[PDB]
């Protein structure tokens, strides 16, 4: 049918004004799309914001405001707060059903940015006897909670055979993550050097290991 496109993630400072967009694939976002905005707090907490023609869920801050900038739906927070840091989903009405978008991960700085603390772990000597090898790259204390993860063995970026967990809120509001690379035992001894390449805020933090 059609797809709703939001921004990947945006960053703003407390007290400033930020605008999230919401693009339709069918065309311009009209009034008959009844754009809704829903806020996802950590631990799966949802609450409606703006929707319908001009309606607002009871208990929604004045700083939140809806509009139609350009040809897409707009959620504008004039005077961002630290607690407004969450994932924001927008939905559009297409004739008979609601269609959500990707959701934008909004970041309001409660503290200055910190580079990701990366540590790579080899396969277990005990687990090598299962004919399976598991390389683990644990990423801690990075903020905003956005991280790219790339694995390189013998100088070659490997596509299949890797997964990475979603960035998760920590005790100290510095997001965390982990990425596991599963290969065969014969593969682990065949190749030599391994590498976990992490990217945060345009910065790049390397972490290699060799057999």
């Amino acid at each position: 049918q059609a797809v709703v496109t939001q921004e990947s993630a945006l960053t703003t400072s407390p007290g400033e004004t930020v605008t999230l967009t919401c693009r339709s694939s069918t065309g311009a976002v009209t009034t008959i799309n009844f754009a809704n905005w829903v806020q996802e707090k950590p631990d799966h907490l949802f609450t409606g914001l703006i929707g319908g023609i001009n309606n607002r869920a009871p208990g929604v801050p004045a700083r939140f405001s809806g509009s139609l900038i350009g040809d897409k739906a707009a959620l504008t927070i004039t005077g961002a707060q630290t607690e407004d840091e969450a994932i924001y989903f927008c939905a559009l009405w297409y004739s008979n059903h609601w269609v959500f978008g990707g959701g934008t991960k909004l970041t309001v700085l409660g503290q200055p940015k910190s580079s990701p603390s990366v540590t790579l772990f080899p396969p277990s000597s005990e687990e090598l006897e299962t004919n399976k090898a598991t390389l683990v790259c644990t990423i801690t204390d990075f903020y905003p909670g956005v991280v790219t993860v790339d694995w390189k063995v013998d100088g070659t970026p490997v596509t299949q055979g890797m997964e990475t967990t979603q960035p998760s809120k920590q005790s100290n509001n510095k997001y965390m993550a982990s990425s596991y690379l599963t290969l065969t035992a014969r593969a682990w001894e065949r190749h030599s050097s391994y590498s976990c390449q992490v990217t945060h805020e345009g910065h790049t933090v390397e972490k290699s290991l060799s057999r």
């Binding site: 809704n36 609450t47 409606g48 929707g51 319908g52 309606n55 009871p58 939905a91």
Partner: peptide, 15 residues
């Protein structure tokens, strides 16, 4: 969010 009418906007969510 609307009383006895489909206002087409989301109010409260469950856990």
């Amino acid at each position: 969010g609307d009383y006895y009418r489909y206002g087409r906007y989301f109010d409260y969510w469950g856990q």
